[PDB]
């Protein structure tokens, strides 16, 4: 499922993300725009051989297991392949796991580099929330 960014500001907020951890929903908006273009089936392999999955681009490194990294944990207790659904409920889960652990949204680092410091609330702005 392809998001619109209203409707995904919408969702993010019905399963709780708005100000998770802090982070107002402008930021989740942001980090998913970025992440995958609001694509709840993207999937991107990283060098080291893990993969990231979803909406939110959730790393196999760490968070969920998809049986073909070697060494990695799986935090979120899912299949990596959960994170690609069309309800975002296990998306948003495991994010509040990672968003949890120590380094709030710099775990993204496309958040890091492409939504902390700037106007994030232009994501959700003349949406119905
Ligand atoms: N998200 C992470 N912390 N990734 C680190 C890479 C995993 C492991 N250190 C490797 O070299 O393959
Ligand atoms: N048992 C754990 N490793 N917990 C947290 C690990 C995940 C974290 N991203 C790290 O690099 O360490
Ligand atoms: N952890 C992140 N948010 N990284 C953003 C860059 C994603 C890019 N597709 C990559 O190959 O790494
Ligand atoms: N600098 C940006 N591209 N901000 C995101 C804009 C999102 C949307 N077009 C809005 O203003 O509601
Ligand atoms: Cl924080
Ligand atoms: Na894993």
């Known amino acids: 499922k392809v998001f619109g960014r209203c409707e995904l500001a919408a969702a993010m907020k019905r399963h709780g993300l708005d100000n998770y951890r802090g982070y107002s ?3 989740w908006v942001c980090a998913a725009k970025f992440e995958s273009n609001f694509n709840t089936q993207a999937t991107n392999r990283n060098t080291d051989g893990s993969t990231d999955y979803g909406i939110l681009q959730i790393n196999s490194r ?4 998809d049986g073909r990294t070697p060494g990695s944990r799986n935090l979120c207790n899912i299949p990596c392949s959960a ?3 069309s309800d975002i409920t ?3 889960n495991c994010a509040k796991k990672i968003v ?4 709030g949204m710099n775990a993204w ?4 580099n492409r939504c902390k410091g700037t106007d994030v609330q232009a994501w959700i702005r003349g949406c119905r929330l």
Do not use: E
């Open 25 to 27: 929903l402008g930021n």
């Open 62 to 65: 760490w968070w969920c297991n």
């Open 83 to 85: 994170l690609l659904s």
């Open 90 to 92: 296990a998306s948003v």
């Open 100 to 103: 949890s652990d120590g380094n």
């Open 109 to 112: 680092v496309a958040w890091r």
